[PDB]
């Protein structure tokens, strides 16, 4: 018997994925399941579908452990699991494992300037490891064989683990090295951490099955082989390991019938220079300027994500903008206004803002290419130094260039409402601060699509994340990896295999 | 050949229509922004015999907001087609518009503070008194200034609640307007039962909805429409809704699918009425997973609309709550799961919650019966453990959206039942604003015949002196407003011969 058939009997595949293996398998701060190895599970899943000849087939992701995986696995609990397990001979015993999807070294990680140098250095040292791992029967075995009198803190999870160092309870943190990286780059103080020690394994990772599953087996690894030799899995590397990790904002959109319009809600998280962050909450209205009409939407949403950069050339107060926003929430030309947007546009952006009493403007020129979903843009403030910081500005600083997928253009309301445009309104409350409200006109004026904006903003704190200019240089919450690839991992990508080291 | 403002509507595919902001409760701003009251049913109701008479069944609609200063001029510049909502219907006025079908007679007169000065007219004699700019209170008190020499100091507002807020902070003694509009400002005010109308009225005055001029085509569908909702009933079934029964508003609980997890996501906001007159926002986000393993529904965005009401049982000696809850969903414009099949008749519900806030800890258990084909929801809370130490109304939304009505169009995304009887896991964290937050974990199954809500609830960071732990919340829900305000004498004679002339 297979799996297969359970699945495609069942109509829905059951897959386990891990909390706090990052960047391989973790929750995004609106607790997405995402990561490297998640990126292989819904490849795999795809796989699935294919194989089976079921487009309609369901997920079902279950959140496992270290310690309660096995178990897991051998009771039914989920069918596979993707995400930082190591294959080895005693676990071959228990389970089955795909091709390798990655390969690590167990280190340590430790504050700098100290004397943690290598494993020899945590002689009657308090030592952190997560329950359930490799690593915690290396250094229990350490700890016997050397006569090292650590006093070894068994911690539920990686996260948990870190934080024990982090906190000074524990001097060095012992994990799979790329592992201990996903840790430090979620730290208050990254920069305060290195991995450091003689490797005390090398540990391959695989997807984790029940054993005596031939067919399930192989749909794994030929779907890795695949992404392997393709290329894919590097592409995969560069996004996780090598560049900004962004988690997308997602926009509610509803319709509001009697202002021929719609209204939306999100939440936009600042992050703070002290590692915490700072909400916005954002309500929003817009109608259109004509009395012609538009389309009226059905419930969706705008999936968002920015990046926020300098140009060397300027010495005025400005930002670069680079925006990509795609529409989703509804599963399977529209408007004439929607036939303005088939090419490059160009915008301009003029704000004139008030917040707290002091008085700025804001001029932004580029272009957008709704096609692709993207905003190119550069912003100054024509009035001197912003008195706030940027990133408070970006949402207020053109919907109308989402890209809306072929299925949803029946929802463009932003499209459908040019040339003659959209008023567009907004309350964004900042917690434990003040507000900002907002009133622009989206419209064309000539060739151009024109955000014009008044911005009013009151009752904010002297010593607040805003007035007080705390707020990090960035959006969406970045998360940055400081880890290479390795050379088993080059060898990895030219030749897929599937055994333990 | 329609007319001038016919033919510009079947031009443009779309009716503008004026509103107004603070008409309370005829034409006013919702605490979500929704343009709502009495004269706003009958703009609905000419709306949809302008698409008859066009026959253009998808005409669209577009409110703009006016105020008593500029709707005539735009109205003039044909910057909306017509109006409904507080105008005066008076001969000064014809010469500039046209004027509908009366739909309500006013007198104007005072409101003031209950227990103090101000009996009639000549108590405002050398004290600030407040009237609406552009209004025909305006011209009166002005000219009772000057005829009568009374030195009053006049203060002009923006519009009613701007008004009724100069005489609610002290800063004038009295707010001149239509009477049913004082009683309206009064409704929403921090302390209704603070403010009184007095004075002998200085004016008669008839509400028409307002048109261009010279357009008898466009009028005559606009009194055609009028008469026939005043003469069979209807009107009287409006005024009942805005004026003598609990205006609410509706919660919309936003739904997104969670395809990661089989389940679905959402995301609202509610609003908590404070004993002192303000409000308390609780921000809920939610997270619901399948508890079985098979198929279920995932749903497109869309959201469920909720009212409730909470009252008492007479017999109940014990710190209880009644409640009675109408939810339906909608967001999606036009059996399929075997669960649905479940919920076809009256369903018996049992609700246990485990509480821990701030560590006083409580239980509670409630009872009664869901009939998801009305979407009705009657239930009985009992708290087992003695007094609650959280206001009942912060645990309602804790405390089945199995039993949501889902339209017929809209049954493909009823998650909530697909996955039943199996069940689900439902989680919240809901941020009560500068207060603490309640974490929630619940199972929602089958056991048996009878719909089972098992909660644990733990409640963090509360301020031992804030609205919840110190039992500052009113007992309701939805935000609502009373008027209590009579059918009047001229209202039934209105209703029982309709006419458009001016008083
Ligand atoms: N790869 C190690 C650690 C982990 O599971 O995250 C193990 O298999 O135990
Ligand atoms: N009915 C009065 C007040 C108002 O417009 O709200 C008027 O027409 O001026």
Redesign the interface.
Known sequence: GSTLDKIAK???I?VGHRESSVPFSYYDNQ???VGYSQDYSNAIVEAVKKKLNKPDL????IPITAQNRIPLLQNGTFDFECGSTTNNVERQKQAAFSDTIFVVGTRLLTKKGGDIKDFANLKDKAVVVTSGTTSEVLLNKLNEEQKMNMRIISAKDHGDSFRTLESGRAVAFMMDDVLLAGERAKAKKPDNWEIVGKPQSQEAYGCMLRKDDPQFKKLMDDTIAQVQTSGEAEKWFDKWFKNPILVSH?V?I??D????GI?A?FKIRHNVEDGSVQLA?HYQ?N??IG????L?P????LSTQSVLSKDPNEKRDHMVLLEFVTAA???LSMSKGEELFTGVVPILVELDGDVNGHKFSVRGEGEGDATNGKLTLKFICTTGKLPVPWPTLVTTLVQCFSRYPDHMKQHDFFKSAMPEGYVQERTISFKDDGTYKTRAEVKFEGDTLVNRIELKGIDFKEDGNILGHKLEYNFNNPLNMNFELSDEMKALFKEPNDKAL
Do not use: E, F, R, S
């Not at 369901?58 to 992701?61: A, D, M, T």
């Not at 019938?257 to 021929?260: G, I, M, R, S, T």
């Not at 009395?291 to 538009?294: A, E, I, L, Q, S």
């Open positions: 069942n109509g829905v059951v607790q997405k399941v369901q997920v079902k992701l997602n509610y509803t319709a019938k009697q202002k021929n209204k809600n909450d209205q109608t259109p009395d012609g009409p538009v009226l059905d419930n969706h949403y929430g509804i599963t």
